[PDB]
Amino acid sequence: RQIKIWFQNRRMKWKKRVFNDARDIIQRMHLRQYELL
């Protein structure tokens, strides 16, 4: 279920942001935008 290996490949371009998200939980499960839906 790793469809974010391409659809989520762009932040590694400027390599100066991922480190931000990665600084949460798992640069994913840390979110929850799936809630409310």
mmCIF file of C-alpha atoms in Angstrom:
data_model
loop_
_atom_site.group_PDB
_atom_site.id
_atom_site.type_symbol
_atom_site.label_atom_id
_atom_site.label_comp_id
_atom_site.label_asym_id
_atom_site.label_seq_id
_atom_site.Cartn_x
_atom_site.Cartn_y
_atom_site.Cartn_z
ATOM 1 C CA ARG A 1 0.000 0.000 0.000
ATOM 2 C CA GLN A 2 2.918 2.277 -0.796
ATOM 3 C CA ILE A 3 1.311 4.458 -3.439
ATOM 4 C CA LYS A 4 2.900 7.493 -1.829
ATOM 5 C CA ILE A 5 6.282 6.420 -3.151
ATOM 6 C CA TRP A 6 5.507 8.346 -6.314
ATOM 7 C CA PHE A 7 2.451 10.433 -5.516
ATOM 8 C CA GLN A 8 4.473 11.729 -2.591
ATOM 9 C CA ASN A 9 7.776 12.321 -4.344
ATOM 10 C CA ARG A 10 8.512 16.021 -4.646
ATOM 11 C CA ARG A 11 9.487 17.309 -1.222
ATOM 12 C CA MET A 12 12.737 15.428 -1.694
ATOM 13 C CA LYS A 13 13.536 17.853 -4.487
ATOM 14 C CA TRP A 14 14.307 20.897 -2.373
ATOM 15 C CA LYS A 15 15.221 18.538 0.444
ATOM 16 C CA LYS A 16 14.360 21.189 3.004
ATOM 17 C CA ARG A 17 10.866 20.331 4.182
ATOM 18 C CA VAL A 18 10.566 16.584 4.623
ATOM 19 C CA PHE A 19 12.794 16.948 7.661
ATOM 20 C CA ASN A 20 9.955 19.057 9.008
ATOM 21 C CA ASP A 21 7.179 16.531 8.523
ATOM 22 C CA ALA A 22 9.537 13.678 9.314
ATOM 23 C CA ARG A 23 9.852 15.486 12.624
ATOM 24 C CA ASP A 24 6.457 14.329 13.835
ATOM 25 C CA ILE A 25 5.775 10.606 13.864
ATOM 26 C CA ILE A 26 6.263 9.023 10.461
ATOM 27 C CA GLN A 27 5.716 11.909 8.073
ATOM 28 C CA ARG A 28 2.259 10.431 7.634
ATOM 29 C CA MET A 29 0.388 8.747 10.460
ATOM 30 C CA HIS A 30 1.249 12.008 12.179
ATOM 31 C CA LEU A 31 -1.519 13.645 10.183
ATOM 32 C CA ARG A 32 -5.223 12.901 10.405
ATOM 33 C CA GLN A 33 -6.804 14.783 7.528
ATOM 34 C CA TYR A 34 -8.647 11.518 7.013
ATOM 35 C CA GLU A 35 -10.763 12.418 10.020
ATOM 36 C CA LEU A 36 -14.194 13.982 9.681
ATOM 37 C CA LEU A 37 -14.404 12.353 6.272
#
